[PDB]
Subunit: 274 residues, 2 copies
């Protein structure tokens, strides 16, 4: 009986609950419940607030969990990413008033307001700087005008909120907030089950007809996750079938066309088990 924790609420909830339904696990039979067991699949789900998720995967009271990477990058628990889930991903970073051109160097002796104080601190120690880290529970983009901080650190999502506070981001992302499946045989089955759901959400099938001399190029354009190559009666052609990432399927299709690919057809898939 695998015990698995899932965000009970917030932005990582509906999407994580959907992924597991998509994989044939039972849903909770009410929304106020914080537990369901699936008799068929032998799992016991628990529904926790994302930040209590890493911790309890680290102390061993849970076999797996779903949280955001920023939380784990910030938890300090003994846990490891076993899977990138593809949703809620954004750059985590620093930002300060649109006045200047900031550097991570300008952080020395500043107060930085952030919801992920430990994450900021490890990073700073790493870059050789010392500054003052203040914890806030949210609404960080206001700490500079309330006069509590000099700069911030947060996930920059749409960026709107930033600019609306005349903050600008600056520096390499400190983390990427992606939902993640973490751990500390029935465990591989769960992993694969989950993975097949993700790959089905992140890739499409491309079927195209590619000229033999472009075979090489074609396959650097679509390596697929083992692409299929089926030589056509015309020695000068070969049918190719590959999974390609969905966010950039059009550019890819355009690439194919520029090298002589024909009948380019993109189609959805649901799961993969391979």
């Amino acid at each position: 009986m695998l015990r698995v924790a899932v965000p009970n609420k917030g932005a990582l909830s509906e999407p994580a609950t959907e992924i597991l339904a998509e994989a044939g696990y039972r849903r909770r039979t009410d929304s106020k419940d914080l537990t369901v067991i699936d008799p068929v699949n032998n799992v016991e789900f628990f529904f926790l607030r994302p930040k209590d998720i890493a911790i309890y995967v680290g102390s061993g009271e849970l076999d797996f969990g779903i949280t955001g990477r920023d939380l784990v990058c910030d938890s300090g628990a003994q846990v490891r990413e076993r899977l990138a889930l593809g949703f809620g991903s954004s750059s985590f970073r620093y930002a300060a008033p649109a006045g200047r051109n900031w550097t991570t160097a300008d952080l020395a002796g500043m107060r930085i307001a952030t919801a992920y104080p430990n994450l900021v601190r490890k990073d700073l120690a790493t870059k050789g700087i010392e500054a003052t880290v203040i914890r806030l529970d949210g609404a960080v983009e206001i700490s500079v005008q309330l006069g509590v901080a000099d700069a911030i650190a947060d996930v920059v999502g749409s960026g709107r909120t930033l600019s609306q506070h005349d903050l600008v981001a600056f520096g390499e992302p400190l983390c990427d907030s992606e939902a993640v499946l973490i751990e500390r045989e029935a465990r591989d089955q769960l992993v694969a089950r989950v993975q097949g759901v993700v790959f089905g959400q992140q890739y499409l099938m491309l079927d195209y007809d590619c000229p033999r001399s472009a075979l090489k190029k074609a396959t650097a354009i679509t390596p697929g996750l083992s692409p299929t190559i089926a030589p056509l009666a015309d020695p000068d052609w070969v049918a190719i079938r590959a999974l390609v990432p969905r966010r950039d399927v059009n550019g890819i299709m355009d690439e194919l066309a520029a090298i002589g690919a024909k009948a380019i057809l993109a189609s959805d898939i649901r799961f993969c088990r391979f």
Copy 2:
């Protein structure tokens, strides 16, 4: 320029934003903003997550704030309630498996999971008991089945979530979570302005005709917040006009009737300034 903080999000937000609009202050002109200033009323609003609210009213970076009483009962900041706002009020308490009849005595050496660890701890010290307090960020009613705790402490709202986890509450409420206006002449004007909005939301006007000999009884049934008494040409009658609380206006009307009150009429009001 009064600086005032308001929950940026969650359950205490829409209601607190409405109260202040109801009082003639400007609203933020977008929902991603965490600040607005009202040029007319001379105030600068800030929009913070409720728990960063008490703290910044205590360090003096904010003149007033709106949060929940459980937060302040749990903050430890130097702040005082200046006004009960009438919304989000529930009993805060302890609960454990519906097995037995618990006592606060049964808490000795248990682990208690709660989102308000300091609040639990002051209470325990107060009652002479020692136990182990664990912090969770939410979803506390699950800590007992995940096996992390033996009892919980939380706001019991509708109670559904409790019973759905076979927890039962037990003991006097440790706090009452009511939204509250906290502080550390333009300040009295703000207070009154806010208060007039609340009283308009919590009371109605009752106008009734009461017999002279029941005058005494009548006025213990409705003391109003200075009731009005206007003797009618008939010496045996006197018209009374009082504000009475809205949650229990029907029982009150029934009381009046039982003592001979006639033409009992309940009506809404919007604000009071008195």
